[PDB]
Write a protein that binds this DNA or RNA. Structure first.
Ligand SMILES: [K+]
Ligand SMILES: [K+]
Ligand SMILES: [K+]
Ligand SMILES: [Mg+2]
Ligand SMILES: [Mg+2]
Ligand SMILES: [Mg+2]
Ligand SMILES: [Mg+2]
Ligand code: NA
Lengths: 272, 98, 95, 89, 27, 51
RNA sequence: CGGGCUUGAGUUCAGUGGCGGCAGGCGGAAUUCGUGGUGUAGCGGUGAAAUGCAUAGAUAUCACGAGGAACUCCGAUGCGAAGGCAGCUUGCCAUACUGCGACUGACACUGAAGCACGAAGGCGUGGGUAUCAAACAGGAUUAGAUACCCUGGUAGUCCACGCAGUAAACGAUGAUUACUAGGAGUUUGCUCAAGCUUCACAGCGAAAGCGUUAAGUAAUCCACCUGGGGAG
RNA sequence: ACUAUAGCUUUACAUUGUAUUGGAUACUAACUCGCGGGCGAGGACACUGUAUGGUGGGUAGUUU
RNA sequence: CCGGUGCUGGUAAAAGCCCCAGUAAACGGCG
RNA sequence: GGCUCCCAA
């Protein structure tokens, strides 16, 4: 759900934000949060390697459980919670042993539900199973790439993948980008799609909101001088020629995947 | 409160004991929701008119029963969560058919 | 022995070899005629009999010359063991 | 609605003289109100059941006609039945 | 059912529908 | 009521290729033909008759 | 105005339905693309051709993988206020017809304003995108071809929510009630009553024609017309 | 504009081995990655060194 | 508008190049 | 200050 702001201000006329309807708690679990220090896009030499990063609201880091190791121990959903670090919401789980954890909240998960992990776990929403136990055709997220490493694949708000066929020790999965690829049957995934699918409908409305989110203004290359950018220069407006970066990397069709990568043997169809 | 009959087909790749255990699990899932079983019969291992998922043969079984008009969705969810059933259908019998 | 016919052309494929009215020489208003189909059948059968294989028919399309092609294939070399029709649309795509 | 024979008999027994009072005012009113409530709860979930919506409008008109007949007959029964069921809104 | 009755109605609809298109995107 | 079971009886109302015979070719009544057609399609969905 | 009656109207009960509405699941044929076997001089299209695909490897043919749309035979009949409704199944609704020796007692008809629904095409946001296909591009025929024919092809066609409110939205025939002749079929409920369509008395009509489903005989209310253009 | 050149990229040799009907397949033991404090996934490829052919105003020295 | 320029494809002891196909909210052109 | 509200948490 989203909320549109009435046009009492020019900076509010085009603002659309979320309704925060699924959030049930206002403060985070203390044992699972730590203060976060911001980079301005600078690496360990102090030189800025990534542009347009800096400022924004102070944030705390929530430790998200992407491994789901406690197999067979049931957990109960305590609260649905806001996370400043990612687009999706998180869910606080209490285990029967007194452990507490955070997971990425799937769509349709409510307070009071029970989740499990492992081969014995039922293929319902919020359960984390090896892909060899997931019946063909269901909607999954938080997909592992190597057994035991942790979820890497389907994590953003609203995104989902589908398990379409299994071929021996591998399964065929269609990815959010449209790629079709093989994943080992030992890898884990969580049933359901990621919640908060209305994230893409939000509109900032003003430059200040990007400043709050921690982004700095971006300058086009055509309005620089030739000493700063290949596309710069000229008197009056000029098109800049073929679009390219500061180092001259073409920006309108040149592929940059390494064309000898071993992971190509596990890709069936390509869409990126 | 209604009379139903469910006819399903089991994969021939499964064993006889596996098929019996699957049928028992289906009957137990039906009884968990709350129902009586009028009859359960096994047409047996027989060929099909057309190939079903590359095998042209399967095990035909059916069960006639009485249940509340709410366990059908649970039966369908179990049928989809079990990947050893290749075809299923469910019918309601009126007073003339029953 | 698959015979793919239509309102415009008739082609035959045995598998190994193939033939068609356009390959035989007929171009327009003659490919869908009894002469061209039998000529193409003879052209394919000249290599069919000289192949070591002696078959079922899989006529697919409707056209004038399927009977002539089947008769020529039966007469030259091997004989038509069975003409099983495979002509194939249960309310499919809009034409 | 559920509209069971037991529910109809209980409604008739509560509203009107004896169970057999199936076709009198203050009982047709109760039956129509029950059906209207159940149809509203059904249309809350099925927002495209326009036939059910039209049937609900017809039921509302029928209840209005019965209430108008009660108006023509007297006012005490009118006041009693509307106070009991809850009508004016 | 003469036929010529509907020809006049068809013809004036064409003039009306064409006259509006000349200034549709014309601000 | 005609059961979809025992499709040998159902084959009496079918043609050589398996299609359903028209009512004017076998007599019958409208209700009987509708029941037969319903029973045929239930068998097709249960792999008891070719499509 | 004050009482009564049950025939009209409505409620209940039983029987009989149904391409009636909404929602969730399941399907085979055809067809599209991608990746691999066989194989090579054409394929496609037309009145005749050409534009197009094809030896840096087509049509055809055998497989595996990923998808979208439509429901052959039954099938002409039935349902819905109308628009409309057709693969199989289930759930939740609505509704109709027939009767009861059950109930209430004129509670009825119509309806200016208003409200609701309302084919196709069209608009906005998000999905999806196989076929067909406005606009557009090329090839033909013609004096010309801004068309008819052929090859491509984007919106659209599909789904969800929201606008829009139009049609040869037609039976070119508003709703309700009562009465008045025969033939030929058909469906359901059992010789009878509902419904469904064409010949046809009286009568009506300018005529074609309508004729128990009236455009006949009568009563109640609503809508609309007053020569053709201009002009919806 | 002339001449070079970082980077990217092609092949050969080295790292680098074994079998079967050569250039394909297969194997695991070199080599790489993940998990836990051996197991799993790859695999003679990838990576890197030497040589070689392309590309290279990204950079440099100059000429005009 | 894909003609041109870019871009995506199909010698030491094979890349390229050619050719053909696509791309203009790519640079660019619309006498 | 508790407290209320809000999202940039
Ligand atoms: K900018
Ligand atoms: K420069
Ligand atoms: K007549
Ligand atoms: Mg400047
Ligand atoms: Mg200038
Ligand atoms: Mg320089
Ligand atoms: Mg110097
Ligand atoms: Na210029």
């Amino acid at each position: 759900g989203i909320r549109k702001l009435k046009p009492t201000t020019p900076g509010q006329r085009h603002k659309v934000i979320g309704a925060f309807d699924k959030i049930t708690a206002s403060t985070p679990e203390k044992s699972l949060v730590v203060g976060k220090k911001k980079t301005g896009g600078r690496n360990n030499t102090g030189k800025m390697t990534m542009r347009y990063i800096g400022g924004g609201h102070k944030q705390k880091y929530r430790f998200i459980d992407f491994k789901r190791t406690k197999d067979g121990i049931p957990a109960t959903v305590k609260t649905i919670e806001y996370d400043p670090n990612r687009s999706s919401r998180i869910a606080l789980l209490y285990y029967a042993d007194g452990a507490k954890a955070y997971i990425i909240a799937p769509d349709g998960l409510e307070v009071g539900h029970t989740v499990m992990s492992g081969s014995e776990a039922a293929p319902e929403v919020g359960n984390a199973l090896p892909l060899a136990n997931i019946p063909v055709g269901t909607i999954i997220h938080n997909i592992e790439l190597r057994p035991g490493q942790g979820a890497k694949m389907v994590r953003s708000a609203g995104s989902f993948a589908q398990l379409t066929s299994r071929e021996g020790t591998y399964v065929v999965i269609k990815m959010p980008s449209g790629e079709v690829r093989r994943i080992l049957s030992t890898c884990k995934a969580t049933i359901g799609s990621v919640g908060n699918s209305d994230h893409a409908l939000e509109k900032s409305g003003k430059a200040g909101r990007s400043r709050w989110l921690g982004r700095r203004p971006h300058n086009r290359g055509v309005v620089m001088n030739p000493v700063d950018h290949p596309m710069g220069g000229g008197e009056g407006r000029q098109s800049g020629g073929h679009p390219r970066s500061r180092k001259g990397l073409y920006a309108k069709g040149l592929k940059t995947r390494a064309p000898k990568k071993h992971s190509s043997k596990y890709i069936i169809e390509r869409r990126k | 409160m209604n009379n139903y009959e469910t006819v399903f087909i089991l994969t021939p790749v499964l064993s006889d004991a596996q098929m019996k255990e699957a049928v028992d699990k289906f009957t137990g899932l039906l009884k968990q929701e709350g129902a009586v079983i009028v009859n359960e019969e096994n047409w047996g291992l027989r060929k099909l008119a057309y190939p079903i998922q590359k095998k042209s043969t399967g095990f035909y079984q059916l069960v006639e029963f009485q249940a509340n008009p709410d366990v059908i969705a649970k039966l369908e969810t179990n049928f989809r969560r079990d990947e050893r059933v290749i075809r299923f259908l469910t019918f309601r019998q009126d007073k003339f058919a029953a | 022995a698959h015979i793919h016919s239509s309102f415009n052309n008739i082609i035959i494929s045995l598998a190994i070899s193939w033939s068609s009215a356009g390959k035989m020489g007929f171009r327009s208003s003659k490919k869908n005629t009894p002469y061209a189909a039998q000529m193409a059948a003879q052209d394919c059968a000249k290599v069919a009999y000289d192949m070591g294989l002696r078959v079922t028919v899989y006529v697919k399309g409707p056209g004038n010359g399927r009977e002539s092609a089947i008769r020529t294939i039966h007469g030259a070399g091997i004989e038509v063991m069975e003409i099983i029709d495979v002509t194939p649309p249960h309310n499919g795509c809009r034409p | 609605m559920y509209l069971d024979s037991a529910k109809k008999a209980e409604l008739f027994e509560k509203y009107g003289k004896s169970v057999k009072d199936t076709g009198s005012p203050e009982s047709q009113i109760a039956l129509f109100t029950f059906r209207i409530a159940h149809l509203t709860e059904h249309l809350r979930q099925n927002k495209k059941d326009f036939a059910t919506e039209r049937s609900l409008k017809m039921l509302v008109g029928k209840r209005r006609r019965m209430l108008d007949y009660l108006i023509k007959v007297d006012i005490e029964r009118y006041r009693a039945i509307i106070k009991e069921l809850g009508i004016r809104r | 059912p003469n036929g010529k009755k509907r020809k006049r109605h068809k013809m004036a609809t064409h003039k009306r529908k064409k006259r509006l298109k000349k200034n549709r995107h014309k601000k | 009521y005609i059961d979809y079971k025992d499709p040998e009886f159902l084959k009496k109302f079918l043609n050589e290729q398996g299609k359903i015979l028209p009512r004017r070719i076998t007599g019958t009544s409208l209700k009987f033909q509708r029941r037969v057609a319903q029973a045929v399609k239930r068998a097709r969905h249960l792999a008891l008759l070719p499509y």
